[PDB]
Structure formats: structure tokens, C-alpha cells
Amino acid sequence: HAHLKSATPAADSTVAAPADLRLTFSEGVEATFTKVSLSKDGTEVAIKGLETPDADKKTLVVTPAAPLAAGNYKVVWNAVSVDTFKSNGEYSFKVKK
């Protein structure tokens, strides 16, 4: 099972808007089969297809379709690991103007 070790922006951080979100897991994850829901104050934020840039597939990149405006974001993730276990979790962060 893939478990989330760290993310950028970090959980409970307040940051300038990030270019994308990067979730680093304890096991490789499958970008095709993993799903992420990004929302702000209870409204869906559109994202692109997911990606794992590294050979080991341990960092998942979530790219918003348009730049992130200020406010309170929630990330709900549903990972499929490279050994094909499903796991899920969630966290939040804030974007400042």
C-alpha cells in the first residue's frame, strides 16, 4: 500500500500559489489508475491527467488546468501502487495572494 510521506505544498502550509502539487509516497504509484480530487472551499478545481516523472514512480504530480487562486484547498487522493494495492487519504493547504 502506498502511503503519503510528504507533499508540496505541505499539509497545513500557507504558500504562494504552486505551479503544481507533488505528492511523495512510500511506494511507487500508477498515474493512469490513481485519482485525485482538488477542491477549494467545497468547489471542484479542474486538473490535468496525473503524472509520475521519476522511474521509481514515487512522486505524483497534480497539475491544475489554470493557476490556483488564493484560498483553502483540499486534496483527496486514491492511489494505486505499483504492486497494485489501493489506498486513499486527504489533506489541506492554503494559497495566499
PDB file of N, CA and C in Angstrom:
ATOM      1  N   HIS A   1       0.855  -1.206   0.000  1.00  0.00           N
ATOM      2  CA  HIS A   1       0.000   0.000   0.000  1.00  0.00           C
ATOM      3  C   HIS A   1       0.887   1.251   0.000  1.00  0.00           C
ATOM      4  N   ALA A   2       0.579   2.175  -0.901  1.00  0.00           N
ATOM      5  CA  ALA A   2       1.264   3.468  -0.958  1.00  0.00           C
ATOM      6  C   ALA A   2       0.702   4.396   0.122  1.00  0.00           C
ATOM      7  N   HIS A   3       1.587   4.950   0.954  1.00  0.00           N
ATOM      8  CA  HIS A   3       1.203   5.899   1.994  1.00  0.00           C
ATOM      9  C   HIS A   3       1.929   7.218   1.737  1.00  0.00           C
ATOM     10  N   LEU A   4       1.249   8.329   2.023  1.00  0.00           N
ATOM     11  CA  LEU A   4       1.804   9.636   1.679  1.00  0.00           C
ATOM     12  C   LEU A   4       2.844  10.037   2.728  1.00  0.00           C
ATOM     13  N   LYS A   5       4.073  10.299   2.274  1.00  0.00           N
ATOM     14  CA  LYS A   5       5.149  10.717   3.174  1.00  0.00           C
ATOM     15  C   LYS A   5       5.201  12.243   3.294  1.00  0.00           C
ATOM     16  N   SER A   6       5.095  12.936   2.156  1.00  0.00           N
ATOM     17  CA  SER A   6       5.228  14.380   2.137  1.00  0.00           C
ATOM     18  C   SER A   6       4.572  14.895   0.870  1.00  0.00           C
ATOM     19  N   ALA A   7       4.219  16.180   0.892  1.00  0.00           N
ATOM     20  CA  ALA A   7       3.646  16.830  -0.262  1.00  0.00           C
ATOM     21  C   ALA A   7       4.178  18.257  -0.361  1.00  0.00           C
ATOM     22  N   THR A   8       4.146  18.785  -1.587  1.00  0.00           N
ATOM     23  CA  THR A   8       4.327  20.214  -1.814  1.00  0.00           C
ATOM     24  C   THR A   8       3.108  20.737  -2.568  1.00  0.00           C
ATOM     25  N   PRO A   9       2.509  21.842  -2.105  1.00  0.00           N
ATOM     26  CA  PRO A   9       2.668  22.419  -0.780  1.00  0.00           C
ATOM     27  C   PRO A   9       2.435  21.392   0.337  1.00  0.00           C
ATOM     28  N   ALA A  10       3.096  21.610   1.471  1.00  0.00           N
ATOM     29  CA  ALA A  10       2.945  20.717   2.607  1.00  0.00           C
ATOM     30  C   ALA A  10       1.535  20.833   3.189  1.00  0.00           C
ATOM     31  N   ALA A  11       1.066  19.745   3.805  1.00  0.00           N
ATOM     32  CA  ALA A  11      -0.178  19.801   4.536  1.00  0.00           C
ATOM     33  C   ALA A  11      -0.088  20.918   5.584  1.00  0.00           C
ATOM     34  N   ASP A  12      -1.166  21.696   5.692  1.00  0.00           N
ATOM     35  CA  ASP A  12      -1.327  22.771   6.685  1.00  0.00           C
ATOM     36  C   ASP A  12      -0.357  23.937   6.438  1.00  0.00           C
ATOM     37  N   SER A  13       0.272  23.987   5.259  1.00  0.00           N
ATOM     38  CA  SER A  13       1.083  25.135   4.881  1.00  0.00           C
ATOM     39  C   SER A  13       0.193  26.257   4.332  1.00  0.00           C
ATOM     40  N   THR A  14       0.776  27.457   4.257  1.00  0.00           N
ATOM     41  CA  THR A  14       0.210  28.605   3.566  1.00  0.00           C
ATOM     42  C   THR A  14       1.305  29.117   2.626  1.00  0.00           C
ATOM     43  N   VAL A  15       1.047  29.097   1.313  1.00  0.00           N
ATOM     44  CA  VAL A  15       2.088  29.345   0.324  1.00  0.00           C
ATOM     45  C   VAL A  15       1.558  30.248  -0.787  1.00  0.00           C
ATOM     46  N   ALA A  16       2.494  30.915  -1.467  1.00  0.00           N
ATOM     47  CA  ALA A  16       2.229  31.453  -2.794  1.00  0.00           C
ATOM     48  C   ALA A  16       1.750  30.307  -3.689  1.00  0.00           C
ATOM     49  N   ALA A  17       0.924  30.614  -4.686  1.00  0.00           N
ATOM     50  CA  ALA A  17       0.340  29.563  -5.492  1.00  0.00           C
ATOM     51  C   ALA A  17       1.436  28.703  -6.105  1.00  0.00           C
ATOM     52  N   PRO A  18       1.337  27.366  -5.944  1.00  0.00           N
ATOM     53  CA  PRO A  18       2.287  26.449  -6.570  1.00  0.00           C
ATOM     54  C   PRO A  18       1.967  26.227  -8.054  1.00  0.00           C
ATOM     55  N   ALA A  19       2.992  25.884  -8.838  1.00  0.00           N
ATOM     56  CA  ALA A  19       2.805  25.572 -10.250  1.00  0.00           C
ATOM     57  C   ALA A  19       2.040  24.253 -10.420  1.00  0.00           C
ATOM     58  N   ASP A  20       2.297  23.316  -9.506  1.00  0.00           N
ATOM     59  CA  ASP A  20       1.629  22.024  -9.470  1.00  0.00           C
ATOM     60  C   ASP A  20       1.792  21.484  -8.046  1.00  0.00           C
ATOM     61  N   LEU A  21       1.092  20.383  -7.758  1.00  0.00           N
ATOM     62  CA  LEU A  21       1.170  19.719  -6.456  1.00  0.00           C
ATOM     63  C   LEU A  21       1.969  18.436  -6.636  1.00  0.00           C
ATOM     64  N   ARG A  22       2.846  18.136  -5.675  1.00  0.00           N
ATOM     65  CA  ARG A  22       3.685  16.963  -5.776  1.00  0.00           C
ATOM     66  C   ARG A  22       3.552  16.142  -4.498  1.00  0.00           C
ATOM     67  N   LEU A  23       3.018  14.927  -4.662  1.00  0.00           N
ATOM     68  CA  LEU A  23       2.749  14.011  -3.557  1.00  0.00           C
ATOM     69  C   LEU A  23       3.776  12.883  -3.616  1.00  0.00           C
ATOM     70  N   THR A  24       4.558  12.729  -2.543  1.00  0.00           N
ATOM     71  CA  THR A  24       5.602  11.727  -2.493  1.00  0.00           C
ATOM     72  C   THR A  24       5.165  10.588  -1.572  1.00  0.00           C
ATOM     73  N   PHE A  25       5.068   9.395  -2.163  1.00  0.00           N
ATOM     74  CA  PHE A  25       4.549   8.207  -1.493  1.00  0.00           C
ATOM     75  C   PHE A  25       5.680   7.263  -1.086  1.00  0.00           C
ATOM     76  N   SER A  26       5.332   6.329  -0.190  1.00  0.00           N
ATOM     77  CA  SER A  26       6.243   5.320   0.322  1.00  0.00           C
ATOM     78  C   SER A  26       6.476   4.180  -0.677  1.00  0.00           C
ATOM     79  N   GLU A  27       5.610   4.060  -1.683  1.00  0.00           N
ATOM     80  CA  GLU A  27       5.713   3.076  -2.749  1.00  0.00           C
ATOM     81  C   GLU A  27       5.428   3.808  -4.059  1.00  0.00           C
ATOM     82  N   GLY A  28       5.917   3.274  -5.178  1.00  0.00           N
ATOM     83  CA  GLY A  28       5.547   3.812  -6.484  1.00  0.00           C
ATOM     84  C   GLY A  28       4.040   3.736  -6.692  1.00  0.00           C
ATOM     85  N   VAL A  29       3.500   4.714  -7.432  1.00  0.00           N
ATOM     86  CA  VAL A  29       2.083   4.753  -7.758  1.00  0.00           C
ATOM     87  C   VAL A  29       1.902   4.851  -9.275  1.00  0.00           C
ATOM     88  N   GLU A  30       0.725   4.406  -9.723  1.00  0.00           N
ATOM     89  CA  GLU A  30       0.368   4.355 -11.126  1.00  0.00           C
ATOM     90  C   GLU A  30      -0.466   5.582 -11.485  1.00  0.00           C
ATOM     91  N   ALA A  31       0.094   6.448 -12.335  1.00  0.00           N
ATOM     92  CA  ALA A  31      -0.567   7.694 -12.695  1.00  0.00           C
ATOM     93  C   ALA A  31      -1.893   7.459 -13.430  1.00  0.00           C
ATOM     94  N   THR A  32      -2.009   6.369 -14.193  1.00  0.00           N
ATOM     95  CA  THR A  32      -3.204   6.133 -15.002  1.00  0.00           C
ATOM     96  C   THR A  32      -4.407   5.791 -14.114  1.00  0.00           C
ATOM     97  N   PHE A  33      -4.143   5.074 -13.014  1.00  0.00           N
ATOM     98  CA  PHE A  33      -5.187   4.423 -12.209  1.00  0.00           C
ATOM     99  C   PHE A  33      -5.433   5.156 -10.885  1.00  0.00           C
ATOM    100  N   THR A  34      -4.449   5.926 -10.422  1.00  0.00           N
ATOM    101  CA  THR A  34      -4.614   6.821  -9.285  1.00  0.00           C
ATOM    102  C   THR A  34      -5.590   7.938  -9.672  1.00  0.00           C
ATOM    103  N   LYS A  35      -6.336   8.449  -8.689  1.00  0.00           N
ATOM    104  CA  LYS A  35      -7.265   9.543  -8.880  1.00  0.00           C
ATOM    105  C   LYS A  35      -7.050  10.570  -7.771  1.00  0.00           C
ATOM    106  N   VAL A  36      -7.139  11.853  -8.142  1.00  0.00           N
ATOM    107  CA  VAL A  36      -7.063  12.945  -7.185  1.00  0.00           C
ATOM    108  C   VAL A  36      -8.233  13.894  -7.435  1.00  0.00           C
ATOM    109  N   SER A  37      -8.875  14.350  -6.353  1.00  0.00           N
ATOM    110  CA  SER A  37      -9.842  15.434  -6.380  1.00  0.00           C
ATOM    111  C   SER A  37      -9.267  16.628  -5.611  1.00  0.00           C
ATOM    112  N   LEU A  38      -9.122  17.755  -6.313  1.00  0.00           N
ATOM    113  CA  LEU A  38      -8.690  19.013  -5.729  1.00  0.00           C
ATOM    114  C   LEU A  38      -9.912  19.921  -5.632  1.00  0.00           C
ATOM    115  N   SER A  39     -10.103  20.543  -4.468  1.00  0.00           N
ATOM    116  CA  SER A  39     -11.224  21.438  -4.297  1.00  0.00           C
ATOM    117  C   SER A  39     -10.796  22.652  -3.474  1.00  0.00           C
ATOM    118  N   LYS A  40     -11.567  23.729  -3.616  1.00  0.00           N
ATOM    119  CA  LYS A  40     -11.358  24.942  -2.865  1.00  0.00           C
ATOM    120  C   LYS A  40     -12.701  25.370  -2.282  1.00  0.00           C
ATOM    121  N   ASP A  41     -12.762  25.423  -0.951  1.00  0.00           N
ATOM    122  CA  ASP A  41     -13.958  25.828  -0.232  1.00  0.00           C
ATOM    123  C   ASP A  41     -15.185  25.052  -0.725  1.00  0.00           C
ATOM    124  N   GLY A  42     -15.012  23.766  -1.032  1.00  0.00           N
ATOM    125  CA  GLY A  42     -16.122  22.883  -1.365  1.00  0.00           C
ATOM    126  C   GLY A  42     -16.514  22.903  -2.837  1.00  0.00           C
ATOM    127  N   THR A  43     -15.716  23.564  -3.688  1.00  0.00           N
ATOM    128  CA  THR A  43     -15.951  23.582  -5.132  1.00  0.00           C
ATOM    129  C   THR A  43     -14.775  22.906  -5.851  1.00  0.00           C
ATOM    130  N   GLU A  44     -15.105  22.045  -6.818  1.00  0.00           N
ATOM    131  CA  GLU A  44     -14.137  21.299  -7.628  1.00  0.00           C
ATOM    132  C   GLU A  44     -13.203  22.257  -8.379  1.00  0.00           C
ATOM    133  N   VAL A  45     -11.909  21.921  -8.421  1.00  0.00           N
ATOM    134  CA  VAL A  45     -10.911  22.611  -9.220  1.00  0.00           C
ATOM    135  C   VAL A  45     -10.422  21.633 -10.291  1.00  0.00           C
ATOM    136  N   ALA A  46     -10.498  22.035 -11.564  1.00  0.00           N
ATOM    137  CA  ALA A  46     -10.122  21.155 -12.666  1.00  0.00           C
ATOM    138  C   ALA A  46      -8.607  20.934 -12.664  1.00  0.00           C
ATOM    139  N   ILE A  47      -8.216  19.683 -12.921  1.00  0.00           N
ATOM    140  CA  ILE A  47      -6.820  19.272 -13.027  1.00  0.00           C
ATOM    141  C   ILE A  47      -6.624  18.472 -14.316  1.00  0.00           C
ATOM    142  N   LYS A  48      -5.363  18.375 -14.733  1.00  0.00           N
ATOM    143  CA  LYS A  48      -4.969  17.573 -15.884  1.00  0.00           C
ATOM    144  C   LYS A  48      -4.875  16.097 -15.478  1.00  0.00           C
ATOM    145  N   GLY A  49      -4.632  15.234 -16.462  1.00  0.00           N
ATOM    146  CA  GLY A  49      -4.234  13.860 -16.164  1.00  0.00           C
ATOM    147  C   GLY A  49      -3.016  13.823 -15.245  1.00  0.00           C
ATOM    148  N   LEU A  50      -2.929  12.793 -14.402  1.00  0.00           N
ATOM    149  CA  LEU A  50      -1.833  12.704 -13.439  1.00  0.00           C
ATOM    150  C   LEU A  50      -0.551  12.195 -14.106  1.00  0.00           C
ATOM    151  N   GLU A  51       0.574  12.428 -13.427  1.00  0.00           N
ATOM    152  CA  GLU A  51       1.866  12.023 -13.943  1.00  0.00           C
ATOM    153  C   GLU A  51       2.789  11.616 -12.794  1.00  0.00           C
ATOM    154  N   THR A  52       3.721  10.714 -13.093  1.00  0.00           N
ATOM    155  CA  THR A  52       4.837  10.368 -12.215  1.00  0.00           C
ATOM    156  C   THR A  52       6.127  10.555 -13.003  1.00  0.00           C
ATOM    157  N   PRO A  53       6.871  11.662 -12.817  1.00  0.00           N
ATOM    158  CA  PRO A  53       8.058  11.908 -13.639  1.00  0.00           C
ATOM    159  C   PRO A  53       9.248  10.964 -13.422  1.00  0.00           C
ATOM    160  N   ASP A  54       9.342  10.315 -12.261  1.00  0.00           N
ATOM    161  CA  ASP A  54      10.528   9.552 -11.924  1.00  0.00           C
ATOM    162  C   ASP A  54      10.312   8.075 -12.261  1.00  0.00           C
ATOM    163  N   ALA A  55      11.420   7.387 -12.551  1.00  0.00           N
ATOM    164  CA  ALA A  55      11.398   5.968 -12.849  1.00  0.00           C
ATOM    165  C   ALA A  55      10.759   5.181 -11.698  1.00  0.00           C
ATOM    166  N   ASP A  56      11.020   5.585 -10.447  1.00  0.00           N
ATOM    167  CA  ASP A  56      10.509   4.828  -9.294  1.00  0.00           C
ATOM    168  C   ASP A  56       9.029   5.134  -9.011  1.00  0.00           C
ATOM    169  N   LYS A  57       8.465   6.148  -9.676  1.00  0.00           N
ATOM    170  CA  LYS A  57       7.028   6.470  -9.650  1.00  0.00           C
ATOM    171  C   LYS A  57       6.574   6.899  -8.249  1.00  0.00           C
ATOM    172  N   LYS A  58       7.489   7.354  -7.383  1.00  0.00           N
ATOM    173  CA  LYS A  58       7.099   7.640  -6.010  1.00  0.00           C
ATOM    174  C   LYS A  58       6.528   9.051  -5.845  1.00  0.00           C
ATOM    175  N   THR A  59       6.753   9.954  -6.809  1.00  0.00           N
ATOM    176  CA  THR A  59       6.159  11.289  -6.724  1.00  0.00           C
ATOM    177  C   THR A  59       5.112  11.482  -7.827  1.00  0.00           C
ATOM    178  N   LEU A  60       3.894  11.788  -7.378  1.00  0.00           N
ATOM    179  CA  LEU A  60       2.744  12.050  -8.225  1.00  0.00           C
ATOM    180  C   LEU A  60       2.582  13.562  -8.396  1.00  0.00           C
ATOM    181  N   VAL A  61       2.487  14.013  -9.652  1.00  0.00           N
ATOM    182  CA  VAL A  61       2.323  15.421  -9.966  1.00  0.00           C
ATOM    183  C   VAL A  61       0.875  15.655 -10.404  1.00  0.00           C
ATOM    184  N   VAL A  62       0.237  16.607  -9.718  1.00  0.00           N
ATOM    185  CA  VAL A  62      -1.135  17.044  -9.953  1.00  0.00           C
ATOM    186  C   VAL A  62      -1.063  18.474 -10.493  1.00  0.00           C
ATOM    187  N   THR A  63      -1.544  18.682 -11.720  1.00  0.00           N
ATOM    188  CA  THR A  63      -1.397  19.974 -12.377  1.00  0.00           C
ATOM    189  C   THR A  63      -2.766  20.611 -12.540  1.00  0.00           C
ATOM    190  N   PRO A  64      -3.012  21.790 -11.936  1.00  0.00           N
ATOM    191  CA  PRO A  64      -4.280  22.469 -12.165  1.00  0.00           C
ATOM    192  C   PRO A  64      -4.402  22.889 -13.636  1.00  0.00           C
ATOM    193  N   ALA A  65      -5.627  22.872 -14.161  1.00  0.00           N
ATOM    194  CA  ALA A  65      -5.882  23.325 -15.530  1.00  0.00           C
ATOM    195  C   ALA A  65      -5.604  24.827 -15.686  1.00  0.00           C
ATOM    196  N   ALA A  66      -5.777  25.597 -14.609  1.00  0.00           N
ATOM    197  CA  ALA A  66      -5.499  27.037 -14.599  1.00  0.00           C
ATOM    198  C   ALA A  66      -4.874  27.393 -13.258  1.00  0.00           C
ATOM    199  N   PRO A  67      -4.098  28.492 -13.160  1.00  0.00           N
ATOM    200  CA  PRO A  67      -3.418  28.813 -11.910  1.00  0.00           C
ATOM    201  C   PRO A  67      -4.343  28.863 -10.691  1.00  0.00           C
ATOM    202  N   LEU A  68      -3.785  28.468  -9.544  1.00  0.00           N
ATOM    203  CA  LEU A  68      -4.558  28.434  -8.320  1.00  0.00           C
ATOM    204  C   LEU A  68      -4.724  29.838  -7.747  1.00  0.00           C
ATOM    205  N   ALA A  69      -5.986  30.232  -7.568  1.00  0.00           N
ATOM    206  CA  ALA A  69      -6.338  31.440  -6.847  1.00  0.00           C
ATOM    207  C   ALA A  69      -6.198  31.205  -5.337  1.00  0.00           C
ATOM    208  N   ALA A  70      -6.155  32.299  -4.575  1.00  0.00           N
ATOM    209  CA  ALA A  70      -5.990  32.234  -3.129  1.00  0.00           C
ATOM    210  C   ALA A  70      -7.163  31.481  -2.495  1.00  0.00           C
ATOM    211  N   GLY A  71      -6.865  30.784  -1.399  1.00  0.00           N
ATOM    212  CA  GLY A  71      -7.897  30.202  -0.581  1.00  0.00           C
ATOM    213  C   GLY A  71      -7.493  28.855  -0.014  1.00  0.00           C
ATOM    214  N   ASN A  72      -8.510  28.124   0.440  1.00  0.00           N
ATOM    215  CA  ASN A  72      -8.351  26.916   1.237  1.00  0.00           C
ATOM    216  C   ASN A  72      -8.573  25.684   0.358  1.00  0.00           C
ATOM    217  N   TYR A  73      -7.504  24.921   0.103  1.00  0.00           N
ATOM    218  CA  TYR A  73      -7.562  23.775  -0.783  1.00  0.00           C
ATOM    219  C   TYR A  73      -7.601  22.464   0.006  1.00  0.00           C
ATOM    220  N   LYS A  74      -8.322  21.493  -0.556  1.00  0.00           N
ATOM    221  CA  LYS A  74      -8.379  20.134  -0.049  1.00  0.00           C
ATOM    222  C   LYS A  74      -7.959  19.198  -1.182  1.00  0.00           C
ATOM    223  N   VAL A  75      -7.105  18.236  -0.832  1.00  0.00           N
ATOM    224  CA  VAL A  75      -6.611  17.202  -1.729  1.00  0.00           C
ATOM    225  C   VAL A  75      -7.114  15.851  -1.224  1.00  0.00           C
ATOM    226  N   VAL A  76      -7.931  15.172  -2.029  1.00  0.00           N
ATOM    227  CA  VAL A  76      -8.406  13.824  -1.718  1.00  0.00           C
ATOM    228  C   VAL A  76      -7.785  12.889  -2.754  1.00  0.00           C
ATOM    229  N   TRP A  77      -6.969  11.944  -2.291  1.00  0.00           N
ATOM    230  CA  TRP A  77      -6.221  11.091  -3.201  1.00  0.00           C
ATOM    231  C   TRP A  77      -6.618   9.625  -3.002  1.00  0.00           C
ATOM    232  N   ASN A  78      -6.615   8.896  -4.118  1.00  0.00           N
ATOM    233  CA  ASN A  78      -6.957   7.483  -4.183  1.00  0.00           C
ATOM    234  C   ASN A  78      -5.878   6.811  -5.035  1.00  0.00           C
ATOM    235  N   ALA A  79      -4.853   6.239  -4.395  1.00  0.00           N
ATOM    236  CA  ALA A  79      -3.655   5.745  -5.070  1.00  0.00           C
ATOM    237  C   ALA A  79      -3.793   4.258  -5.407  1.00  0.00           C
ATOM    238  N   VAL A  80      -3.218   3.893  -6.553  1.00  0.00           N
ATOM    239  CA  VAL A  80      -2.960   2.513  -6.914  1.00  0.00           C
ATOM    240  C   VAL A  80      -1.441   2.358  -6.984  1.00  0.00           C
ATOM    241  N   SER A  81      -0.883   1.475  -6.150  1.00  0.00           N
ATOM    242  CA  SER A  81       0.562   1.313  -6.079  1.00  0.00           C
ATOM    243  C   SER A  81       1.056   0.458  -7.248  1.00  0.00           C
ATOM    244  N   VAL A  82       2.377   0.424  -7.428  1.00  0.00           N
ATOM    245  CA  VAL A  82       2.977  -0.404  -8.474  1.00  0.00           C
ATOM    246  C   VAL A  82       2.800  -1.907  -8.193  1.00  0.00           C
ATOM    247  N   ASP A  83       2.514  -2.297  -6.944  1.00  0.00           N
ATOM    248  CA  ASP A  83       2.176  -3.702  -6.632  1.00  0.00           C
ATOM    249  C   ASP A  83       0.660  -3.897  -6.580  1.00  0.00           C
ATOM    250  N   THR A  84      -0.081  -2.835  -6.884  1.00  0.00           N
ATOM    251  CA  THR A  84      -1.485  -2.868  -7.297  1.00  0.00           C
ATOM    252  C   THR A  84      -2.419  -2.977  -6.093  1.00  0.00           C
ATOM    253  N   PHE A  85      -1.985  -2.367  -4.989  1.00  0.00           N
ATOM    254  CA  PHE A  85      -2.828  -2.106  -3.844  1.00  0.00           C
ATOM    255  C   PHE A  85      -3.479  -0.730  -3.986  1.00  0.00           C
ATOM    256  N   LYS A  86      -4.686  -0.605  -3.437  1.00  0.00           N
ATOM    257  CA  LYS A  86      -5.396   0.652  -3.388  1.00  0.00           C
ATOM    258  C   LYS A  86      -5.284   1.232  -1.977  1.00  0.00           C
ATOM    259  N   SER A  87      -5.056   2.544  -1.886  1.00  0.00           N
ATOM    260  CA  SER A  87      -5.076   3.273  -0.639  1.00  0.00           C
ATOM    261  C   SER A  87      -5.677   4.650  -0.902  1.00  0.00           C
ATOM    262  N   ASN A  88      -6.055   5.358   0.157  1.00  0.00           N
ATOM    263  CA  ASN A  88      -6.648   6.671  -0.036  1.00  0.00           C
ATOM    264  C   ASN A  88      -6.413   7.517   1.212  1.00  0.00           C
ATOM    265  N   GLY A  89      -6.329   8.835   1.023  1.00  0.00           N
ATOM    266  CA  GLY A  89      -6.176   9.751   2.122  1.00  0.00           C
ATOM    267  C   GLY A  89      -6.555  11.155   1.691  1.00  0.00           C
ATOM    268  N   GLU A  90      -6.256  12.132   2.549  1.00  0.00           N
ATOM    269  CA  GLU A  90      -6.596  13.510   2.252  1.00  0.00           C
ATOM    270  C   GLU A  90      -5.786  14.450   3.142  1.00  0.00           C
ATOM    271  N   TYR A  91      -5.644  15.693   2.670  1.00  0.00           N
ATOM    272  CA  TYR A  91      -5.011  16.751   3.438  1.00  0.00           C
ATOM    273  C   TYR A  91      -5.428  18.092   2.827  1.00  0.00           C
ATOM    274  N   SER A  92      -5.054  19.182   3.503  1.00  0.00           N
ATOM    275  CA  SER A  92      -5.405  20.524   3.070  1.00  0.00           C
ATOM    276  C   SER A  92      -4.174  21.433   3.128  1.00  0.00           C
ATOM    277  N   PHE A  93      -4.234  22.530   2.365  1.00  0.00           N
ATOM    278  CA  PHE A  93      -3.242  23.602   2.429  1.00  0.00           C
ATOM    279  C   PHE A  93      -3.928  24.893   1.977  1.00  0.00           C
ATOM    280  N   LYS A  94      -3.259  26.029   2.197  1.00  0.00           N
ATOM    281  CA  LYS A  94      -3.788  27.324   1.830  1.00  0.00           C
ATOM    282  C   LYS A  94      -2.847  28.003   0.836  1.00  0.00           C
ATOM    283  N   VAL A  95      -3.456  28.716  -0.114  1.00  0.00           N
ATOM    284  CA  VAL A  95      -2.751  29.616  -1.013  1.00  0.00           C
ATOM    285  C   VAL A  95      -3.051  31.052  -0.579  1.00  0.00           C
ATOM    286  N   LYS A  96      -1.990  31.841  -0.423  1.00  0.00           N
ATOM    287  CA  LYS A  96      -2.130  33.275  -0.165  1.00  0.00           C
ATOM    288  C   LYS A  96      -1.949  34.071  -1.467  1.00  0.00           C
ATOM    289  N   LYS A  97      -2.477  35.299  -1.467  1.00  0.00           N
ATOM    290  CA  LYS A  97      -2.426  36.181  -2.631  1.00  0.00           C
ATOM    291  C   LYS A  97      -0.985  36.655  -2.862  1.00  0.00           C
TER     292      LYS A  97
END
